[PDB]
Design a protein around this ligand. Structure first.
Ligand code: A1AK9
Length: 1106
């Protein structure tokens, strides 16, 4: 098996968050862990400024900042889920930012079952040690000597086997842990000192205490309080020596508090977040003492308001809180001293997309044909949603004029008072036209000073309240009031101008090979200098960059013949830098531009190639050449603003926006047909807009947010579970569940209680529903509620037998507390007609209906340990045809032709065939290796894909004996690092090295793709990986091969049959010399030594598949 796996959407769920001074001594930073990704921000009064985002070869399990004695700057400790430990430092060497690994090592033990309650990692306030709870009964200590670069550790026996939480205390002479543990006698809090000298615990400073039965979190309180707060379900207690204070506030009893964060450095106030998204303030009241110590007088809890359900909370000063969510969108909120109308102190400032968990999804061509969109069931509880995801950036067209032959567009302010454009100047072969803008009206008009009988190459507002028009014949300077020609420049023999560039006070024009530099003065075009280039000029730019006061010391130029992009000094025209771009196709557009504070040269060729380089605006040096391909026609580049950010629109057959993300250039398709020319337009009637032209038409519209994927959110206010599309009804079916309390009563309104119409089947509880949702408005048209204690598990939309209706079919389970698994459930066939669901037929079965699939006009269903095929009879009932029994728990089905792939709870996958001339199933083959499955997919007749609970993928094949024949072989293995809930065939790209397309959705909201490769392609890419791994410096010095090794509690093996597309794609981001190392000696097709250029082309083809 040869497979390739790549990220289409990175994990969005927030697994943890910390604050401190990491980037510099005086920066306040927010660090966010999104599984495999670490995001670093500087906190401002403006908000969060992104400075650096890195990938780890690992799932981040522990992330803590700490400050070694007498240092100005925090270091970062990370532990991965595979027990990779590192200490990281942030270093900025001028422009370049580097994460350096100061220490690393793997801290796994040989014997050890991972603690069921997870990895805990803590660091003592005096930075003497890191403490890790990895396994029950052991506490691992890493001394923080500067010498301990390998992070060598020792284990201490911990008598208490079941630790709930642990922290290091402040204000202690020896490092001291405080922890809650559980035994038969209940829950207790205890302390121990940790002796480095003895490598053992010593007696803690205070005696143990019994605590609440559901005590779950330990907070170490800084000086001057010291001590610990213990949070439980109905109590909050403070402990410190012969000091004990407890409160039992009813207000917290409704929902478990699951996260905390310190507001005040001295511990006077904490935030607390619960499972329903309530946000509390915990206040510690001080009492003075004669000896000048400070003790705790009392504790209070106050309800502040509501946030997203928080996985973590981080106070960012000035009343600002970052709410990191796993189950909904993350937020920035503000806390105010005074409450609002409805009584909340919490006001939301910003919302960040989280797709996670993705519990189901499907692919549908909603709008066009051939343009797939992903529709997910996302989130949980009050955060549950549908998310609709599609590639590319949209334009909202607001005007359309038929007007062929446009050769350029320029906006103009004809009134020197008003700030908005009021004029659009259009060029045509040998002619110019001026459109005036009065509101939404676009009237043809003249404009005194400008000529209409020459083609315009540039026109604009310029210095000293003047306008400029540059044509093939001359440069014309025009006064604003009144409009009159005040100056006109011509070449000495009045030869044609061939190329024009202009800013507010400078002009460079070309005449064949000649260049002329003019300055714009009051009533004067002043000729400053001229030169003769070695070849004919193709293109020019003099865009001023940086702190430049609108003046460029640089001229960028592209030439014929040598195909060079050059940087020249003005006024002398001295050559500062030359780059030969190769080939025999001339540069067509060149642009100096700034993205996220870094300066670049862009240069586009007529064949669709785009080169880009770092530009030093001081020396004129170009560096770090990169090349993408943006189409096959000449590309024309032009800056525009939207949402207070400068970007570049690339006009071609493939219109593109160029922008920056994490200080790397990014290229995103615009969803339009061919655009030939554009300009920004910001007029009264068309504010913050774009004017667009093709061969026949002028358009004016606004642009969506600049990003790779557009996401629409449909709030449900309850948990979505499964989704299916029903084309004939133009709706989705969505299974959903809401929580109600002890009959039962609801916590808030939600999709299933707010449908247009409703039907019903004739502690906290789940109430399950089938929602019918309109595909255009996403309005809830109908909700059908299932029986009390009925859980809806599976859903399909299909036709059966000879019946022409399409039905929604739901499989359920009746859930009773004492049952190990369900012994009762239903299959229900519904028809959606006239705005309601009618129940057409039912069938009681003796188990949970985990999975259903349409199979050759029949209904395949898995019921507990049985796989069953039903026929749909002429009297509209389901009738069993055949059964398969050899499963533990058949959770997952997929089919292809007569083949059925079965995913088991614990015995991996199994391949059935229906035998149409015997009316029964045959077991073809089974994977005899145990695996705890989460999802399955058929890649093709011979290849079966599985995902399992320890975040691995594998691929099974038949072994091309007869006892031998029924053994599936695991021929592919890969540690993905995500939990796959759903696989589905399809693509987000409009319909090569790869064949097939399978998308997957995950708990962290990551979306991935799996596709197939030939042996040949695999071998090349495998070889590339090995070379890439030798040159790339990895954060924490984790080996890529270690990261991607298949890993469960049973077995660890190198990955095989799987290319890591994220790694391959990173090839485009290394330095050109590194690309040479990577390239040196490797075959490529009959055969030859491959070049860096060859590989850039290949990797580009591979980015196109998502
Ligand atoms: C195992 O524990 C440790 C603790 C601290 C360091 C360390 N401190 C530093 C300082 C000096 C220059 N940069 C910050 N660089 O590494 C290394 C390993």
């Amino acid at each position: 098996s040869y497979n390739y796996v790549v990220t289409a959407q990175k994990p969005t769920a927030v697994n943890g968050c910390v604050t401190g001074h990491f980037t510099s001594a005086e920066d306040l930073n927010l660090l966010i862990a999104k599984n495999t990704r670490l995001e670093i921000y500087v906190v401002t009064a403006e908000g969060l400024r992104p400075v650096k985002e890195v990938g780890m070869y690992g799932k981040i399990a522990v992330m803590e900042l700490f400050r070694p004695k007498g240092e100005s700057k925090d270091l970062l400790f990370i532990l991965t889920a595979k027990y990779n430990a590192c200490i990281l430092e942030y270093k900025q060497s001028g422009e370049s930012i580097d994460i350096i690994t100061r220490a690393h090592g793997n801290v796994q033990d040989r014997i050890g079952r991972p603690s069921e309650t997870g990895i805990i990692g803590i660091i003592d306030p005096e930075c003497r040690m890191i403490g890790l709870r990895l396994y029950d009964g052991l506490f691992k200590v890493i001394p923080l000597d500067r010498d301990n670069k390998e992070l060598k550790a020792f284990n201490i026996r911990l008598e208490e086997l079941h630790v709930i939480d642990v922290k290091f205390l402040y204000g202690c002479q020896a490092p001291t842990i405080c922890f809650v543990y559980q035994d038969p006698q209940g829950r207790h809090v205890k302390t121990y000192e940790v002796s480095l000298r003895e490598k053992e615990f010593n007696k803690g400073p205070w005696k143990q205490e019994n605590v609440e039965a559901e005590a779950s979190m330990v907070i170490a309180v800084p000086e001057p309080f010291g001590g610990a707060i213990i949070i439980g379900q109905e109590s909050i207690t403070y402990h410190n020596g012969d000091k004990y204070l407890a409160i039992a506030p009813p207000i917290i009893k409704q929902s478990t508090i699951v996260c905390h964060n310190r507001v005040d450095p001295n511990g006077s106030r904490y935030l607390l977040g619960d499972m329903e998204g309530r946000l509390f303030m915990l206040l510690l009241e001080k009492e003075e003492q004669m000896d000048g110590t400070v003790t705790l007088k009392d504790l209070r809890v106050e309800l502040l308001g509501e946030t997203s359900i928080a996985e973590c909370l981080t106070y960012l000063d000035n009343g600002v809180v970052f709410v990191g969510s796993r189950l909904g969108d993350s937020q920035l909120v503000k806390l105010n001293v005074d409450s609002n109308e409805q009584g909340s102190y919490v006001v939301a400032m910003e919302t960040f997309t989280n797709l996670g968990p993705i519990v189901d999804m499907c692919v549908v061509d909603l709008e066009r044909q051939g343009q797939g969109q992903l529709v997910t069931c996302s989130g949980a509880f009050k955060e549950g949603s549908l998310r609709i995801i599609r590639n590319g950036i949209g334009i909202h067209e607001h005007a359309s004029i038929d007007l062929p032959g446009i050769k350029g567009l320029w906006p103009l302010r004809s009134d020197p008072n008003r700030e908005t454009d009021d004029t659009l100047v259009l060029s045509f072969v040998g002619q110019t036209r001026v459109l005036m803008l009065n509101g939404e009206e676009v009237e043809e008009t003249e404009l005194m000073g400008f000529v209409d009988d020459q083609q315009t190459f540039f026109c604009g507002n310029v210095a000293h309240q003047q306008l400029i028009q540059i044509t093939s014949a001359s440069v014309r300077l025009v006064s604003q009031e009144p409009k009159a020609l005040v100056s006109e420049w011509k070449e000495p023999q009045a030869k044609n101008i061939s190329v024009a560039s202009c800013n507010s006070s400078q002009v460079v024009v070309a005449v064949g090979r000649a260049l002329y530099y003019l300055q714009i003065h009051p009533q004067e075009l002043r000729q400053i200098s001229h030169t003769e280039m070695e070849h004919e000029v193709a293109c020019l730019d003099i865009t001023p960059l940086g702190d430049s006061n609108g003046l460029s010391p640089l001229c960028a130029i592209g030439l014929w013949t040598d195909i060079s992009a050059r940087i020249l000094k003005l006024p002398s025209f001295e050559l500062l830098h030359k780059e030969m771009l190769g080939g025999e196709i001339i540069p067509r557009s060149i642009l100096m531009t700034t993205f996220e504070s870094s300066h670049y040269l862009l240069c586009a060729l007529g064949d669709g190639a785009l080169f880009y380089f770092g530009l030093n605006i001081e020396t004129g040096l170009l560096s770090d050449r990169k090349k993408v391909t943006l189409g096959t026609q000449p590309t024309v580049l032009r800056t525009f603003r939207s949402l207070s950010t400068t970007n570049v629109f690339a006009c071609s057959d493939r219109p593109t926006v160029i922008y920056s993300s994490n200080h790397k250039l990014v290229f995103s398709n615009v969803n339009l047909k061919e655009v030939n020319y554009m300009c920004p337009l910001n007029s009264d009637g068309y504010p913050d807009s774009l004017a667009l032209a093709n061969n026949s038409t002028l358009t004016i519209g606004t642009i969506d947010e600049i990003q790779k994927l557009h996401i629409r959110t449909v709030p449900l206010y309850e948990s979505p579970r499964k989704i299916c599309y029903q084309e004939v009804s133009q709706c989705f079916g969505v299974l959903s569940s809401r929580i109600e309390v002890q009959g039962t009563t609801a916590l808030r309104p939600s999709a299933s209680t707010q449908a247009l119409s409703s039907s019903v089947s004739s502690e906290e509880v789940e109430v399950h529903n089938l929602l019918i949702i309109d595909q255009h408005t996403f309005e809830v048209l109908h909700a059908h509620q299932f029986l009390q204690n009925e859980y809806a598990l599976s859903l399909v939309s299909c036709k059966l037998g000879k019946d022409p209706n399409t039905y929604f079919i739901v499989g359920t389970a009746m859930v009773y507390p004492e049952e190990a698994e369900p012994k009762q459930g239903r299959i229900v066939v519904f028809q959606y007609s006239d705005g309601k669901l009618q129940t057409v037929a039912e069938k009681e079965v003796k188990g949970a209906v985990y999975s259903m699939v349409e199979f050759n006009g029949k209904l395949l269903a898995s019921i507990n340990s049985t796989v069953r095929l039903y026929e749909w009879t002429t009297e509209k009932e389901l009738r069993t045809e055949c059964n398969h029994y050899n499963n533990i728990m058949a959770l997952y089905l997929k089919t292809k032709g007569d083949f059925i792939l079965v995913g088991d709870l614990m015995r991996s996958v199994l391949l059935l065939a229906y035998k149409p001339m015997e009316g029964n199933f045959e077991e073809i083959a089974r994977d005899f290796n145990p695996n705890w499955m989460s999802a399955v997919e058929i890649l093709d007749d011979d290849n079966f894909l599985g995902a399992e609970n320890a975040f691995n993928l594998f691929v099974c094949q038949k072994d091309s004996t007869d006892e031998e024949r029924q053994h599936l072989q695991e021929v592919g293995l890969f540690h993905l690092g995500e939990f796959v809930n759903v696989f589905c065939h399809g693509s987000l790209v409009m319909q090569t090295p790869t064949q097939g397309s399978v998308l997957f959705g995950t708990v962290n909201g990551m979306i991935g793709l799996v596709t197939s490769l030939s042996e040949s392609w695999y071998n090349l890419l495998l070889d590339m990986q090995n070379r890439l791994n030798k040159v790339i410096k990895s954060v924490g010095k984790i080996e890529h091969s270690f990261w991607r090794s298949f890993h469960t509690e049973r077995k660890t093996e190198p990955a095989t049959g799987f290319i890591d597309g994220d790694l391959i794609e990173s090839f485009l981001d290394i330095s050109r010399p590194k690309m040479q190392e990577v390239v040196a000696n490797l075959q490529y097709d009959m055969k030859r030594e491959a070049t860096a250029d060859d590989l850039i082309k290949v990797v580009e083809e591979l980015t196109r598949i998502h």
